């Protein structure tokens, strides 16, 4: 980081414990942008093949958006899972290693002495 | 004279943009244009081995 994580199973898109995380919503803005990305591929394909860029090959456009949305949805599941995994051993290490992580008794500004810079 | 011809149109335009763009332009052909004969290319590979191995000695 985490290819050496214990229990890590290579060549497995989504491991089992990932399902315990909240699945991305259908109306997730990042997901719908991926669909919008699929739309943009539709215009270009009609443009390269010099077809009507807005009404030709609606079947092609329909495939061009759904495929992006699917691979999008699975990608965000993995996206959330790794960030959750990184946050997991995060808090596992802080609890198992108290000494190396000092919690200084931070004290209010009435007791600290920060120099004032007279600007002019 | 001192406003456009000397400073603005020439001097400030000489120091940063023209000179630096020249430098890119000047030593490009020293590094881009090459003779093309196969012998010198691997001859160049030679000294690269020693300097890596001996001069800086990435091993040490």
């Amino acid at each position: 980081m985490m290819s050496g994580r214990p229990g890590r199973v290579p060549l497995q898109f989504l491991p089992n414990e990932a399902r315990s995380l909240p699945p991305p919503k259908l109306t997730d803005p990042r997901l719908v942008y991926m669909g919008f990305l699929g739309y943009c591929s539709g215009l270009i394909d009609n443009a390269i093949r010099r077809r009507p860029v807005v009404s030709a090959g609606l079947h092609r456009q329909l495939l061009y958006v759904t495929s992006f949305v699917f691979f999008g949805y699975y990608l965000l599941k993995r996206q959330d899972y790794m960030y959750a995994l990184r946050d997991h051993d995060m808090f596992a290490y802080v609890k198992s290693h108290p000494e190396d992580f000092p919690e200084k008794d931070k004290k209010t500004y009435g007791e600290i002495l920060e120099e004032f810079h007279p600007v002019r | 004279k001192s406003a456009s011809s000397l400073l603005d149109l020439i001097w400030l335009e000489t120091i940063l943009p023209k000179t630096t763009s020249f430098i890119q332009m000047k030593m490009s052909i020293m590094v881009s244009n090459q003779k093309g004969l196969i012998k010198l290319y691997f001859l160049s590979f030679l000294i690269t081995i020693m300097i890596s191995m001996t001069l800086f000695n990435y091993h040490e």
């Binding site: 980081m1 985490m2 050496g4 994580r5 214990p6 990184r86 051993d89 995060m90 596992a92 290490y93 802080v94 290693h97 190396d100 | -």
Partner: protein, 63 residues
């Protein structure tokens, strides 16, 4: 809208951004501590597995 809208809402912006700010600083130092000492779940590099070795008796005794 009145001031209770922007006030409580800006509180939410600051609190979320502050927790995000300190989590980032923890992550940088946690990642450093993990790479230096190696006693962590991640940053662990492959080592040769034991099950590959063979315990069966060999031809020579001294092994």
């Amino acid at each position: 809208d009145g001031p209770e809208k922007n006030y409580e809402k800006t509180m939410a912006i600051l609190q979320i951004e502050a927790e995000k700010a300190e989590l980032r600083l923890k992550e940088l130092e946690v990642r450093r501590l993990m790479r230096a000492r190696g006693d962590g779940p991640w940053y662990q590099y492959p080592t040769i597995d034991k099950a590959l070795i063979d315990h069966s008796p060999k031809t020579t005794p001294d092994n």
